[PDB]
Amino acid sequence: AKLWDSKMFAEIMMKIEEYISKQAKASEVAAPEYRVIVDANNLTVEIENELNIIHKFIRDKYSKRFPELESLVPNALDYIRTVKELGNSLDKCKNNENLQQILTNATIMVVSVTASTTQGQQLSEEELERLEEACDMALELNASKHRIYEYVESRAPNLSIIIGASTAAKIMGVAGGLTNLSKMPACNIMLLGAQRKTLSSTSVLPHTGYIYHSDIVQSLPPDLRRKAARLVAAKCTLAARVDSFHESTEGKVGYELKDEIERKFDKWQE
Amino acid sequence: DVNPKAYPLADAHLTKKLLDLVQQSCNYKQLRKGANEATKTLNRGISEFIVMAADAEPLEIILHLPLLCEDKNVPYVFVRSKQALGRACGVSRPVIACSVTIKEGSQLKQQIQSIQQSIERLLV
Amino acid sequence: PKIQQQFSDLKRKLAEVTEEEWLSIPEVGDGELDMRKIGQARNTLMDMRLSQVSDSVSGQTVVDPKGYLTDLNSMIPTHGGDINDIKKARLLLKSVRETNPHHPPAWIASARLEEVTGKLQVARNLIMKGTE
Amino acid sequence: DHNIADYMTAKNNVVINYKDMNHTNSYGIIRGLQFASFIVQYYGLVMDLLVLGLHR
Amino acid sequence: DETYGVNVQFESDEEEGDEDVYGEVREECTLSAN
Amino acid sequence: SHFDLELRAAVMHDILDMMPEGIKQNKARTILQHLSEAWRCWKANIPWKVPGLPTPIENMILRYVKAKADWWTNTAHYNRERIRRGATVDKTVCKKNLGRLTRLYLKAEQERQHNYLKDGPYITAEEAVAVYTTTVHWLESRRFSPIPFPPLSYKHDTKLLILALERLKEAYSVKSRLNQSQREELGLIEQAYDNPHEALSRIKRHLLTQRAFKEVGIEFMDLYSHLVPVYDVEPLEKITDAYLDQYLWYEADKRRLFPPWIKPADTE
Numbered sequence: 001a002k003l004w005d006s007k008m009f010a011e012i013m014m015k016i017e018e019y020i021s022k023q024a025k026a027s028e029v030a031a032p033e034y035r036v037i038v039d040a041n042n043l044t045v046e047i048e049n050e051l052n053i054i055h056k057f058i059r060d061k062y063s064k065r066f067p068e069l070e071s072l073v074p075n076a077l078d079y080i081r082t083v084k085e086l087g088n089s090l091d092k093c094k095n096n097e098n099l100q101q102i103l104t105n106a107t108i109m110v111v112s113v114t115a116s117t118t119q120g121q122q123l124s125e126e127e128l129e130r131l132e133e134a135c136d137m138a139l140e141l142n143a144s145k146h147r148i149y150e151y152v153e154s155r156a157p158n159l160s161i162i163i164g165a166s167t168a169a170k171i172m173g174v175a176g177g178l179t180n181l182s183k184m185p186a187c188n189i190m191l192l193g194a195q196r197k198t199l200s201s202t203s204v205l206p207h208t209g210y211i212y213h214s215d216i217v218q219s220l221p222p223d224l225r226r227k228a229a230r231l232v233a234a235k236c237t238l239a240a241r242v243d244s245f246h247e248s249t250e251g252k253v254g255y256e257l258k259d260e261i262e263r264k265f266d267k268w269q270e
Numbered sequence: 271d272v273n274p275k276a277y278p279l280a281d282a283h284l285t286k287k288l289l290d291l292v293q294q295s296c297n298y299k300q301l302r303k304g305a306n307e308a309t310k311t312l313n314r315g316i317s318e319f320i321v322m323a324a325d326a327e328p329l330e331i332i333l334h335l336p337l338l339c340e341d342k343n344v345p346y347v348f349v350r351s352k353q354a355l356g357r358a359c360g361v362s363r364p365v366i367a368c369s370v371t372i373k374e375g376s377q378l379k380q381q382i383q384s385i386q387q388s389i390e391r392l393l394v
Numbered sequence: 395p396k397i398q399q400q401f402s403d404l405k406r407k408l409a410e411v412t413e414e415e416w417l418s419i420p421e422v423g424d425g426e427l428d429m430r431k432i433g434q435a436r437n438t439l440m441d442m443r444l445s446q447v448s449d450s451v452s453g454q455t456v457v458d459p460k461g462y463l464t465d466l467n468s469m470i471p472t473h474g475g476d477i478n479d480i481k482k483a484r485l486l487l488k489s490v491r492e493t494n495p496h497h498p499p500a501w502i503a504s505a506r507l508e509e510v511t512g513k514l515q516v517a518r519n520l521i522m523k524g525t526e
Numbered sequence: 527d528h529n530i531a532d533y534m535t536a537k538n539n540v541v542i543n544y545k546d547m548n549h550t551n552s553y554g555i556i557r558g559l560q561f562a563s564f565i566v567q568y569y570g571l572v573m574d575l576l577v578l579g580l581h582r
Numbered sequence: 583d584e585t586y587g588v589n590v591q592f593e594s595d596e597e598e599g600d601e602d603v604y605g606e607v608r609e610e611c612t613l614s615a616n
Numbered sequence: 617s618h619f620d621l622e623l624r625a626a627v628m629h630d631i632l633d634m635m636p637e638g639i640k641q642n643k644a645r646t647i648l649q650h651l652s653e654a655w656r657c658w659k660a661n662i663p664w665k666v667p668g669l670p671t672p673i674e675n676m677i678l679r680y681v682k683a684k685a686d687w688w689t690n691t692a693h694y695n696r697e698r699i700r701r702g703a704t705v706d707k708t709v710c711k712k713n714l715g716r717l718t719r720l721y722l723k724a725e726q727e728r729q730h731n732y733l734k735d736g737p738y739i740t741a742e743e744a745v746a747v748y749t750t751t752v753h754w755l756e757s758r759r760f761s762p763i764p765f766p767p768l769s770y771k772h773d774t775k776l777l778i779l780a781l782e783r784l785k786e787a788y789s790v791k792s793r794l795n796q797s798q799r800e801e802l803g804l805i806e807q808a809y810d811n812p813h814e815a816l817s818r819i820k821r822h823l824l825t826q827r828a829f830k831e832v833g834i835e836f837m838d839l840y841s842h843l844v845p846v847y848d849v850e851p852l853e854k855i856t857d858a859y860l861d862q863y864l865w866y867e868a869d870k871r872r873l874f875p876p877w878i879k880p881a882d883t884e
Binding site for chain 3: 622623626627630631633634635636638639643646647649650652653666667668669670672673675676679732733734735736737739741744745748749752761762763764765768810811813817820821824825
């Protein structure tokens, strides 16, 4: 009913946002940049949700030809690519070179074995074309997501040294600029970008965002991740302040703080 | 000698008065220790005045506090040693920033007002 | 051959090492196959087949964890009575009643305790005794 | 019940540990749990069904 | 009768051999594959 | 008998011989400690790698450890054969042999588990479905009703908890010397005895949610015919397992799950 409607609405929204992003990328060589950065950050979530609904649609449609494939390929993009590559003919697991670019040899064996005894029936040509167009829409949305992520990475030497460049951009955009970030307590920076995550509480990680879900924090055992978050946030705050005055542009402070964080992690894990 | 950027630097006599008043405030439960808690008090508008140490190693980690104090119309001073400030605050670690908060009907009001007037004359 | 006969080759080879490495020795105080994957794939295949078979089976029973947890959280008592204090009061009231065959307040107190905590048959028997 | 079955399997799949060594027991039952008797007897019932045949 | 005033004794009594205090014998959806 | 002593002494002499004089006055004890550490790591089946230790000395230590391990395994097996066949021995020798056998058995068990992970399940899907279908056919023929999850107000939970706690307590033939874990477990059992309902709610909570547990400690009772593994578990999980065991057995008997030919029976 609203499948193509949502597809077109997201196409228009992504067209506007990607025009803005490509204009910024071209211009790389009162309407601040962090505004478009946060816009892209939320558009990423929108794209993820749209990809999820598209994946659900594809699963429901393809569950009559190869009902068992969903179990073997839990990942969304991999499942979409596999259904695109197999189509109505399940005899494409034999001597296939594209399938080896999506899955591992073990799961290729498993899917080939399962396809031989599946009890599924053929799809009509109309259903096949609907599935193909859905897959193409998913792939183009994924390409748009990749472009957004490239721009988001391209977009504060010390704060970036401590935590990447993507997370720094996310936290500064949600804060509303580097100056606004510099004048917040660390306990508030720790909570920038935290959802509510309705229960269906310990299993939800109630108070975590943009620092808990970071490369350097997720790089620890779960039981140490909250403490680490705190620590990182603390040091991040310091770096932010040093950045708000344009001092230590070489990143010396960031390197020192990262070394201290690494020493604390090592001591925790000894 | 200390740092040009810690502009309103108190002298030994005013330093002694400030540390004594900070000790009294700690005894009266009217003190917040740390730059984060000083920032929180400034945002909540419950701060009498802010005392910072002039020997913070980068010293840019507490230079947002003078700007916040100007925005919120609160006096501020710099002391020379963070060890002394931490001792006066009631802890053994160094402290680089602290805030004296507002309590209704407290007996320290006169001393706080005198210290505020003394601080406000240092900005020349 | 011999122990040192075996070790002579490696002793000679050790003779090459240099003095800088000699004196810098620390002290004790301080493609391929992802062999797991194939096992994981086989396990997943068996599990999917077994679930396929189980789908035919009907009479199984499974409770909803969230519903049961909600029911337990609701059922948690809000009062009751500390068990050690309850046992102390029980001994106290037993001594009271036994010492006084003619203290209706004592018998009523014992029955009240035995009915607020525990079961009611013992209270009923004790109260028949107290009535008589 | 499905939850009880999951709990029993998870219990049987845990990390053994001696004075200094340790591994992750994942093939056989641990035999030291309080319900190992029930597990063994049920598996033996399955073996009995295999050996005898359902009719006999 | 109010009978105010009470005396209470605490003792480690009630020791028995664990036998009955009196020597009396006190006596008192299915699965389907479709 | 003293082959290990001879090997260690020869290794020490060889390493000291070419070692320059100027630094051997200091590094001899360090290298001895290194040999001890390498042997301990091999015994414990854990990696041993000293980043700053020169490769020739590393190779020398590795050769020493390999030879000592060969002798260790051979002598452990021979001593076990002697004791089993029947030959007078003493307490210290028996204990040392038991420790060596425990370590070797644990190494073999780890090898077994890793080989299982590598070779995947040995049951083919066809055999698995065959046995599954046979079991469901038998259960349907019996009309057996699956055991439900213990309800909140199940009548007998207090009785089952008392039975479980009694069984757990009976494990103490008091020697007057009980370790910290055993004493803590006894305290927990006494607390459960005291307060039944809170412990019961805890047990239900664990049965319904817990899926990641602690480790268990394995030792070996020494019957000369064969060692017997003995497992110790955390006290709380012990309580939960005991309750579940009692409940499952009671309900299985109630439903007559186990045919009469399964032994031992309770009446004989």
